[PDB]
């Protein structure tokens, strides 16, 4: 059956732009395995297709057979339920809390990105910080599976690549996206770094960036700089 995702476009109206819900489901079909076409959107100049299948204009969408999906956390439920064993691997997180550890980071982000108050920075900073702390966290802290790891390196530090254990799931299609817009905006426009500090956030990143799936629905930089150029510039 006929899967095409329908995702926003960058500054040449054609290319993939900026979009973490985009990249998201986009990493959600690329985990599926699934025979699956992705269609860009200049929002600008949408096609009379495009109009016609998605008359309220939310993006990213869902064409899949002749029904229509909008809401990314419908479109991701859906997927899953419907993208199923024998055929196709469950992606979903075992522990529940692997789908809230690091879920306010995206928040603190752009509350300090968009922020122009110079006596506010230092403030917003530290919460984009702490948050990215309680991610750190979960990555540090062993998982059910690892209990008294009679294999661990240090005692009570966890080793596993990704959110859940050792596999992508649902969760890091979510945050993954989030992270990677978090590094190149504050990067480029406040010279903010994670800190080295967080070894569970590089670890977890590191492995992320070795996998395609992840490497590969990445927007280019250019195009994530470009989308918060003027919010970024506000501060004075």
Not at 111 to 122: F, G, R, T, V
Not at 156 to 179: H, I, M
Request: aromatic residues 10%; contains cysteine.
């Amino acid at each position: 059956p006929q899967v095409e995702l329908f995702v926003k476009a960058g500054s040449d109206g054609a290319k993939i732009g900026n979009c973490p819900f985009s990249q998201r489901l986009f990493m959600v079909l690329w985990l599926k395995g699934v025979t699956f076409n992705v269609t860009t959107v200049d929002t600008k100049r949408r096609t009379e297709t495009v109009q016609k299948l998605c008359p309220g204009g939310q993006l990213p969408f869902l064409l899949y057979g002749t029904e229509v999906h909008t809401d990314t956390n419908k479109i991701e439920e859906f997927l899953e339920a419907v993208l199923c064993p024998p055929r196709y691997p469950k992606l979903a997180a075992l522990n529940p809390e692997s789908n809230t550890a690091g879920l306010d980071i995206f928040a603190k982000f752009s509350a300090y990105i968009k922020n122009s108050n110079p006596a506010l920075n230092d403030n917003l900073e530290k919460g984009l910080l702490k948050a990215l702390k309680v991610l750190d966290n979960y990555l540090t802290s062993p998982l059910p599976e690892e209990v008294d790891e009679t294999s661990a390196e240090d005692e009570g530090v966890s080793q596993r690549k990704f959110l859940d254990g050792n596999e992508l799931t649902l969760a890091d299609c979510n945050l993954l996206p989030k992270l990677f817009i978090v590094q190149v905006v504050c990067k480029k426009y406040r010279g903010f770094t994670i800190p080295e500090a967080f070894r569970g956030v590089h670890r977890y990143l590191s492995n992320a960036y070795a996998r395609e799936e992840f490497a590969s629905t990445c927007p280019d930089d250019e195009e994530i700089e470009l989308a918060y150029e003027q919010v970024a510039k506000a501060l004075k």
